[PDB]
Amino acid sequence: MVLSEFEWQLVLHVWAKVEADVAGHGQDILIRLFKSFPETLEKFDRFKHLKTEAEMKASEDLKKVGVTALTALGAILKKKGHHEAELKPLAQSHATKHKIPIKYLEFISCAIIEVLHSRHPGNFGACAQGAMNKALELFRKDIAAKYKELGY
Ligand code: HEM
Ligand SMILES: [Cl-]
């Protein structure tokens, strides 16, 4: 699949809004991920002992991990699909070091869209939502192809 230039514009304007508060968006996304799909928390050895949303919001380690994930996703999105070099190390680490199945990438994609809706009422309409869904689907499909090459 491919996104049109119009669709990429929609994605990057939304992302520039995320960049006004990377840490807050990353906290909200990880917390939504763990509340909607609690098994995903087991993959995060650094903070899988956290038990409540209040503990998650207070965790400096969780916030840093959210910043790192959103920083990398923003860099990838800015490549507008020409992301082969940037995606390679991420697919490698998530397949073999962190052991993240594709379904967990689907779960975090759902969490991303929900947090964008929640944080940007009136500025995340049907076109931007559809474009962001396509951008995240392309990201997952391109990771899944690298997973396949690694036999994961
Ligand atoms: C938008 C999707 C994601 C992006 C862009 C992303 C990005 C990153 C980056 C850049 C790192 C640090 C460098 C590296 O190890 O490659 C990282 C680490 C990690 N990621 Fe992801 N990630 C995503 C989704 C996920 C999901 C869904 C999970 C688990 C359910 C996950 C689990 C981890 C773990 C456990 C680490 C190591 C964290 C630590 O140091 O404590 N990632 N991720
Ligand atoms: Cl829109």
Residue numbers in the entry: 0 to 151
Reproduce passages from the article:
For this study, a sperm whale myoglobin variant Mb(H64V,V68A) with high activity and stereoselectivity for olefin cyclopropanation reactions via non-native carbene transferase activity59−63 was used as the model enzyme. The high stereoselectivity of this carbene transferase is dependent upon the configuration of the two mutated residues in the distal heme pocket, which enable the precise control of styrene attack to the heme–carbene reactive intermediate during catalysis. Using a myoglobin-based cyclopropanase as a model enzyme, our studies show that covalent stapling with p-chloroacetamido-phenylalanine (pCaaF) provides higher stapling efficiency and enhanced stability (thermodynamic and kinetic) compared to the other stapled variants and the parent protein. Crystallographic analyses of singly and doubly stapled variants provide key insights into the structural basis for stabilization, which includes both direct interactions of the staples with protein residues and indirect interactions through adjacent residues involved in heme binding.
